[PDB]
Amino acid sequence: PEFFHNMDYFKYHNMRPPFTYATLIRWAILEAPERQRTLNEIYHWFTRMFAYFRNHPATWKNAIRHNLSLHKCFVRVESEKGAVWTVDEF
DNA sequence: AAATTTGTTTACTC
DNA sequence: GAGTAAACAAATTT
Numbered sequence: 001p002e003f004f005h006n007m008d009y010f011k012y013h014n015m016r017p018p019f020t021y022a023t024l025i026r027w028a029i030l031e032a033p034e035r036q037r038t039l040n041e042i043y044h045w046f047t048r049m050f051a052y053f054r055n056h057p058a059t060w061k062n063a064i065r066h067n068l069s070l071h072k073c074f075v076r077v078e079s080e081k082g083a084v085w086t087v088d089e090f
Numbered sequence: 091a092a093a094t095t096t097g098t099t100t101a102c103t104c
Numbered sequence: 105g106a107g108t109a110a111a112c113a114a115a116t117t118t
Contacts, residue, residue: 020105021107022106060107066107066108067106
């Protein structure tokens with residue numbers, strides 16, 4: 001099922017986070033010191049920070065792409081080393 | 091080329 | 105409204 005209680009950031013049990021994909025990406029973007037991540041680093045952040053997303057990569061990687069291009073608060077920026085994703089706080 | 095991750099789109103269960 | 109599902113074009117790497 002989903003989270004049993006009010007536990008904070010324990011990623012060590014394969015339990016679904018109680019948060020939307022839109023918000024999880026937004027936190028992932030703002031964790032980086034430069035406030036942007038590539039799509040691949042977003043994938044690394046998700047697997048690293050949650051045990052649940054370590055089992056069925058295809059199902060949720062599709063969601064991650066779907067949310068990025070559907071919300072106007074996610075912006076793609078070309079960089080020197082490749083495309084990155086930022087967040088509009090407004 | 092051709093392979094394949096990387097991005098936009100409309101519509102189904104729940 | 106979100107979580108999936110698929111379908112398809114665009115970047116980006118073989």
